[PDB]
Design an enzyme around this catalytic site. Sequence first.
Site: not given
Ligand SMILES: [Zn+2]
Lengths: 51, 460, 117, 487, 49, 49
Positions: D97, D100-101, D170, D177
């Site tokens: 995950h 992905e970012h 990030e 998040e």
């Molecule tokens: Zn995410």
Amino acid sequence: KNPQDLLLEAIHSAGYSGALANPLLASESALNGLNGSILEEFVAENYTAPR
Amino acid sequence: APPLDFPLPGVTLPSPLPDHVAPGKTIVTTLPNGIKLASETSAGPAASIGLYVDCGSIYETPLTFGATHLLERMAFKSTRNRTHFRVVREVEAIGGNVQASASREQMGYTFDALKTHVPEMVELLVDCVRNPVFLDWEVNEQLLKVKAEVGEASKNPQDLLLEAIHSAGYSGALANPLLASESALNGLNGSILEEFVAENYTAPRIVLAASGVEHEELLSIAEPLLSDLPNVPRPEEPKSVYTGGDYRCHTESGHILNGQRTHFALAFELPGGWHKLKDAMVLTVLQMLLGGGGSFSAGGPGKGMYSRLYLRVLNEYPQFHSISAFNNIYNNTGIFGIQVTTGSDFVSKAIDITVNELLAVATSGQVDQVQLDRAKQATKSAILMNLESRMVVSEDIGRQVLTYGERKPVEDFLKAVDEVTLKDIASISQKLISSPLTMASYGDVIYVPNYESVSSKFRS
Amino acid sequence: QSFIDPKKNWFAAQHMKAISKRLRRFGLRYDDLYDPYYDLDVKEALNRLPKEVVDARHQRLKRAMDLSMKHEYLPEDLQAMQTPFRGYLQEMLALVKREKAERESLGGLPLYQRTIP
Amino acid sequence: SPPPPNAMVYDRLAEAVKAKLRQLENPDPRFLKYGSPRPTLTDHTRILAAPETRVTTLPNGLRVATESSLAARTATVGVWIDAGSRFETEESNGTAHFLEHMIFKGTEKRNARELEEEIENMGGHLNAYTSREQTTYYAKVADKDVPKALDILADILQNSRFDENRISRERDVILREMEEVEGQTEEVIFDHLHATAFQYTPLGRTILGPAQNIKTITKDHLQNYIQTHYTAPRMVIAASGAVKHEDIVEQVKKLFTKLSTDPTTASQLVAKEPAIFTGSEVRMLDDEIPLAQFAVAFEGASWKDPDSIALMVMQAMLGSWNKTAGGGKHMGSELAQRVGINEVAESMMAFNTNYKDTGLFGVYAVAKPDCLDDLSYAIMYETTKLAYRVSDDDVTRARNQLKSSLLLYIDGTSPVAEDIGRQLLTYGRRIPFAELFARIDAVDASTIKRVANRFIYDKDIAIAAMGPIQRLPDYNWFRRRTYWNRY
Amino acid sequence: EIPATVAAVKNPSSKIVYDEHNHERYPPGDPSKRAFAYFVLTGGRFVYA
Amino acid sequence: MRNQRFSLLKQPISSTLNQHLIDYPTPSNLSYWWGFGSLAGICLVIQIV
Ligand SMILES: [Zn+2]
């Protein structure tokens, strides 16, 4: 059910800016931040011998 | 049966379609009573049928307030031929989906199933709109759910505001409220709805629109069932004028203490909305040019990360939490504006940071020609990608034969976005700020300015 | 059938005026004898009726339970103003029963059930 | 001297109820010609034609599949990978995950601002999502920017750079998040359900990972994940719209040349660490929350299992009811009539999840704390009844609804391309619409009882609950009601 | 310092430990003893008859 | 009440037996010394029969 103190308070907030716009009978959210220690030190500060 | 990585033996397979299927053209047919059937084929296996009526929330006299938010809840119910139990069981027997919606100028009823079920889909849709009985025990159980949702509408403060930029701002029909209050839900019953519909649902105001159906099939079904509605004269269209206006509501008394924050907005007006065709496409480009968002949404390359209201407001003022433009175009008038939330201690200059941006595009040199080309590419693709669905396609044939009497090809929409130049962005946005400022607010209202403190910062 | 119609038969036009005589002395209508505790479908037919029609039923029933405690009848001025056999209930009760025969031929659970005592 | 029948208000309010009911008595026989409330089974062969799906396997192992529709003006093209959260090791649990970012931010040829500007100048989009077994990167463009869109997806998957100024910025996007998906309460129920049903297996972990893993992950780990998993036999290029198959194949044959060459497939990784179901429960009691939420689940079928189609017909029999729905008290499903008539819930939903070796089948519900006894009786009564007593109109209606919902969902260029790419990873092929309809109507009332006896009857369950749940029954109450001591 | 019941709703770990003072568990990956549990409960229901 | 039926043990004919002999809430740490009260009601039935 008293639309002459509903209005008489509304000719007071709309019309002034500072102290005289503070409401007399307050709303629902300021009744949720009030307890027995807010009243206790509001009185120990504002109830003095020259007043 | 074999596992699903091995094919099943004994099944017939249809022969496939070619790689270039030629698209069909919309066929429109007008009946003697004034109703218009419109059809168009497609290359999927599914159909989508809708019925659109000219009525809406502007035909509401003070005896029938709230009577179109309730017609959306009474939509597919008991008729003269079917009970409410037989309507629910007939839609589930073929695996369909049924839906309704109401606007200030348009009512719409839709159906979609597989293309095998087209004669079934049509006669249930016509019967549920042409022959509703309104039984009091069905109307009363729908009123009690509308009364328990007017108990709280304070959790969507962008349709609270968007309705408050419409009452304050207009005078006549366009100021009639869409979602109504508590007292007009007490004068409503099953006989108010019954004669509001017998007056306002007439043959010159009805359009049937299909997507994925051949035009000679739609006339073997829907013609023997709609031809005997009477031909009546249409009424005169309700009128209103754009005045200015201010509105404010210090929020409901439990919403604060580091809580409500602030929600304000501004608005303007521009005389024609869709019958002056050239001017509306300029403003849709100006909407994607201004753009903006809430910016804590984490998508990707995409929506609005290189708009004016993004890299010139939220990219350096972190106290904003939302800023975006909005347009609400109707049939002659129109509305353009900007909605903002900010903090309660950061509010009055956020009106400032807002207004200049509307002043920056009124200037003839502040916008680039590399910014105009981005907003004209992101607008032609948003029209083209949205028209892939069969449901948006049927909704386009409905709401365009109610405004123009014909469907305009999409080539004429891409042709007239090409022409927009850097000076049409300046002239129409200079005809935008020549009208009074509509303002609305919510939340902590005490710390905001007043009407004439802001309205004289534009012209008049 | 053919043995119950009073304008053809003679012994049904004397059974008719025997119940008509006995209903007038308490001021009751024939539909007031239908109990929402006997038949659960009668309870539903009365919830779909207007409030002013059900309120006149509850007041005719209270006037008659008062006349039988006191062992007396309505005075004969009020007895000439009474309409037995003027109905308010039979058409709504036939509709509730017709909707229940449709929900059973097609599958589907009943909308209200009787409690087991 | 009887009053006339208009004199009293209650006598003339009663002649107006009899006149409202006399217009329900003369039906028009031309409005009753095609529709019927009884379900029948019909044939859909004339309308099921489609364009051709063309699959081509490159010599390195890469597969390219397309469905061309040359009259459109848009396209969708993307990459589907056979990798996810399951293939990590609990010291790298949030890696797939995080990667992905951090993949829209690198690339020695184009930095973060240049990549973000090339997409918006065209008028396109660029998305990504991760799951426990699958990853996706795809783009929606116009038909003349397809060679530019495919040029970007090949360069960010092969030549991405991960610098420390970008990594650490990030770590505060993802740690915020996490905090917003701690308050949705449907993703929180379904995340505790996986951790208790598949405990001590790799399928029980979460996708985002623990919060201590996220502040430790450095480039080292991001690069061994992208050299162990993103390899040519485990990747599918799928395109749909105004594309041509032979022109896309020659582009990918010269753009995808530099990805890694490990010969480990996904099946060698599922087989040396399988997933095992355990009957167990988790209950989180709070009593200051106004509504209670819970889910109860059986073990289900995998992807290639032939019984998977019957567990989708059975899910359409249990159904779904919400408080805003127009069906009301009149729905086909008998579990939705129990919830709807008595008002014992806010919403109810049946689910069915498939995986490579296992699955989950069950019901999720939201209700008020004084309704949890009569709601739990109705849920368990109707699931166990599928093993005993199945009506023939119940399965005909649930077959007509599954045929229609699987095809009404494929509408546009992006639903077509995610149908191609996801089915090549789970079945190895795309199933045509005429075979899929032929496997659905081979599920009759006798097939329902045989699959119900394999998966439901006298089996263990898993429960996860949250809220004011002191009146929800306990595990022995639930386990006992998986059979009927009465027949 | 986070509350212990708050730090358990925020971390769905798949390594659960039970109380093993009275009962020991069958290690994960074993079949269920449902058929044995039925046949012990039959030979006493023989006796009550 | 509810609008239609449910578990038959929650019906009026068996409510006094349900709420006092089946669903009755009991402390969870009762030992075997709390067992001699139903044992004395069996000894009274044996003497009567
Ligand atoms: Zn995410």
